[PDB]
Nucleic acid binder design. Structure first.
Ligand code: ZN
Lengths: 53, 141, 167, 65, 71, 83
RNA sequence: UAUUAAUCUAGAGUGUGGUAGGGAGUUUUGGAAUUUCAUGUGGAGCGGUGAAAUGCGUAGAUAUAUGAAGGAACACCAGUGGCGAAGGCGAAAACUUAGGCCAUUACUGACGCUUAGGCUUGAAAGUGUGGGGAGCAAAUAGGAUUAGAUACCCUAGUAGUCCACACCGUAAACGAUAGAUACUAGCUGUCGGGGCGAUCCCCUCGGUAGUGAAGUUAACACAUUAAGUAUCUCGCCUGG
């Protein structure tokens, strides 16, 4: 995730890199069933459908 | 002529004909199609001569392979059908047989039942006239 | 059925011993020949494989019976100069019907669709316009005749007009 | 704009358009989704298969540029 | 009784006298309303502004009538 | 791996009769012969076992139908080892 | 209707062309991540909780870089998606192999649906034998809160989770909706085949979803993939 030129325009983009790293890593630190894995994956997929379109 | 559509027959002829009539009546349809059979042809003939439906035409392809019959249902200028309720008594595995003296009367004679005794399909009142009983096809009123 | 194979070799080594390795591997295959030996030269690896940082990408294009793989597969792993042994077979996702191959017309017309060398580049590829030749070539007919002409009737209408008149 | 369907590519093998496949690869060596690639469902599966198969051949990185 | 400008999306089983005209567009609703108004007016002896009157007339001022599709 | 075209010429009765009962049961016997070897090779191929059962049941049903219409029809068809 | 003697193809199958799919089994291959160990760099904490403590640490941990070994699962692609009869199927390859859809001027000519008994498959847990054991974790030990805590929390922690051959045959094995067939408004998507053809969009035949009238239902609701109009067959219910 290397990107930086002078001071801050890369830092403003660092926030986006981290948030998504945090979201993806947060589901590899607690264990739950595969069925729940798929259920929460589909629930998250509905969320993108509601706002990002 | 030029039906440009594939049509097939459901199952035993008695049940196949009634369901089309009932569904067309409920959905306000006017024209339907089905495969032809001499029992179905005769029952459609007796039905039209009992004044329950319009034209039927039995259609054959440019060969002696398939025969189909299409029949229009009687309606009114105010769009109310003549057919009120159809119910078949004969049934595969439940062949019903009543003698002449136990010949039913559909809704006090208002309706018409199809009773093919010995001379093809044949109405209940003319059955009493000929005092011969046999197969009971379906109640129509 | 068609076959394709990609070879990974020991990097910094030169080209003639790579051809010698090719020739050695040629006999390793079974009685299936009629293959080309065009190669992709030397390309830098995206990541280290065992210890090397580069290698040569090579290719076979033979076709024959299913026995062609077993001996080459078992001798590729043991050899110290062979790194990867991908075996492409016809089971890839493809279709090359002779009637669908002549889509080069799509290439030529798409080239025009990308021609925007002038200032007036108002054309946009993602823009419907609804042209159509519309050659139907599909009716699905079923001829029919008449056999029984029971009591005819005429047509009518179902136009509704209630109550007729007020008073 | 599935430019594979627009051009009628009709076939994807490893070494004929590898530079084109690298565009579908995100900078962080990750397979981009539909919202960025623009490919159709059928072609996206083909692209995923080809990219993974190339990953087996070490033509493209895994966790870095 | 009730008469309605039964556009193609209504249910005709309710309206008694069906008038399959256009009402979303401005030019047609005013036109047919004016014919009905003159129809009831002529029965009152009054003059008919837009009905039975012939040509080079029935030309109504138009918030222009174009663009049928809606989103 | 099945030699489907060749096996037709054996039990075929006319020039262009490919859907007859005899050719169908011949193909089913060939399929059973291949799939039995495939199954004994891989004892835990359950879907292949279901396919084998379906094919053998279809073969039995077609043989039973053939034995009903004409007894003499398959006197020459029993050349294949059955029963 | 049933029997028998026959003809036809529209039912259902076979062949030809087109064609999609994480369908299944066997054998090999790969990278991240964790753990352990080895080599340095460095000096006092690490760890964990609402808060702390058992635990680890000057006999050098956490951190950081390199390397090796080992086992397990295959981010992103991944979606109002695909396949399978159900359970389920998602890193890559090879071999074997199953079923499905579209068009058929081809062929057999009713060979079709259902299925008591039977046979096959059937999540996880569990059991027998031989291996394997990185992570996790019933039982168990200790530290916390509580009046009690044998629980929720924390630190250790075996069987097991993994593989080879068998056994067990149960689950909310759910669409709480048995299978087969004919008919019954429409609209919005999406996936595959076909024709037309730069995609987008045109439409045809199919699979998978949402909205929605007559119709059904006690209501919720179903509504062309029915819980609608009807038939055939099986299984099942008769208060707690
Ligand atoms: Zn595409």
């Amino acid at each position: 995730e290397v990107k930086n030129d002078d001071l801050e325009l890369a830092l403003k983009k660092f926030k986006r890199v981290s948030l998504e790293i945090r979201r993806l890593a947060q589901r590899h630190e607690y264990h739950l069933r595969k069925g729940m894995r798929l259920r929460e994956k589909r629930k998250i997929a509905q969320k993108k459908r509601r706002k990002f379109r | 002529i030029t039906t440009t559509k594939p049509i097939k027959a459901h199952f035993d002829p008695v049940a196949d004909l009634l369901t089309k009539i009932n569904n067309a009546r409920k959905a306000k349809l006017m024209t339907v199609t089905t495969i032809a059979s001499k029992l179905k042809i005769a029952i459609l003939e007796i039905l039209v001569k009992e004044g329950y439906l319009a034209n039927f035409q039995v259609l054959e392809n440019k060969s002696k392979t398939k025969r189909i019959v299409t029949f229009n249902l009687k309606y009114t200028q105010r769009r109310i059908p003549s057919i009120n309720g159809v119910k078949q008594i004969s049934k595969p595995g439940l062949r019903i047989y009543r003698p002449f003296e136990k010949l039913p009367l559909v809704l006090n004679g208002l309706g018409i039942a199809i009773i093919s005794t010995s001379d093809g399909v044949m109405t209940d009142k003319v059955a009493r006239l000929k005092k011969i009983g046999g197969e009971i096809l379906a109640y129509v009123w | 059925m068609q076959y394709n194979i990609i070879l990974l070799v020991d990097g910094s080594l030169s080209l003639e011993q790579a051809n010698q390795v090719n020739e050695k591997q040629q006999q390793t295959l079974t009685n299936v020949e009629g293959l080309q030996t065009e190669y992709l030269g030397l390309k830098e690896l995206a990541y280290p494989i065992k210890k090397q940082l580069s290698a040569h990408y090579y290719r076979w294009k033979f076709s024959g019976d299913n026995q062609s793989t077993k001996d080459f597969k078992r001798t590729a792993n043991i050899n110290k100069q062979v790194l990867r042994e991908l075996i492409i077979n016809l089971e890839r996702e493809y279709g090359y019907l002779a009637s669908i191959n002549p889509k080069k017309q799509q290439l030529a017309l798409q080239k025009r669709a990308k021609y925007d060398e002038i200032i007036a580049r108002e054309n946009n590829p993602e823009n419907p316009d609804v042209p159509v030749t519309s050659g139907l070539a599909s009716t699905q007919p079923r001829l029919s005749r008449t056999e029984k002409a029971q009591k005819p009737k005429e047509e009518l209408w179902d136009v509704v007009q209630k109550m007729g008149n007020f008073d | 704009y599935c430019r594979f369907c627009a051009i009628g590519q009709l076939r994807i093998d490893l070494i004929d358009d590898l530079e084109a496949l690298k565009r579908f690869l995100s900078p962080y060596a990750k397979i981009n989704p539909r919202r960025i690639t623009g490919n159709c469902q059928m072609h996206q599966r083909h692209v995923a298969k080809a990219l993974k198969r190339a990953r087996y051949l070490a033509l493209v990185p895994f966790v870095k540029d | 009784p009730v008469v309605a400008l039964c556009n193609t999306n209504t249910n005709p089983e309710l309206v008694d006298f069906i008038i399959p005209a256009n009402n979303h567009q401005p030019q047609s609703t005013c036109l047919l309303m004016n014919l009905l108004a003159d129809a009831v007016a002529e029965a009152k002896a009054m003059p008919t502004m837009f009905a039975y009157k012939p040509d080079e007339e029935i030309q109504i001022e138009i918030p222009q009538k174009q663009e049928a599709p809606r989103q | 791996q099945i030699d489907k075209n060749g096996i037709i010429k054996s039990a075929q009765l006319h020039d262009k009769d490919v859907g007859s009962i005899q050719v169908q049961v011949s193909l089913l016997t060939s399929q059973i012969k291949q799939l039995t070897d495939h199954l004994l090779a891989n004892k835990k191929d359950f879907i292949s076992k279901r396919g084998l059962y379906a094919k053998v049941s279809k073969r039995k049903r077609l043989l039973k139908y053939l034995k009903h219409n004409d007894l003499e029809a398959y006197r020459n068809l029993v050349k294949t080892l059955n029963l």
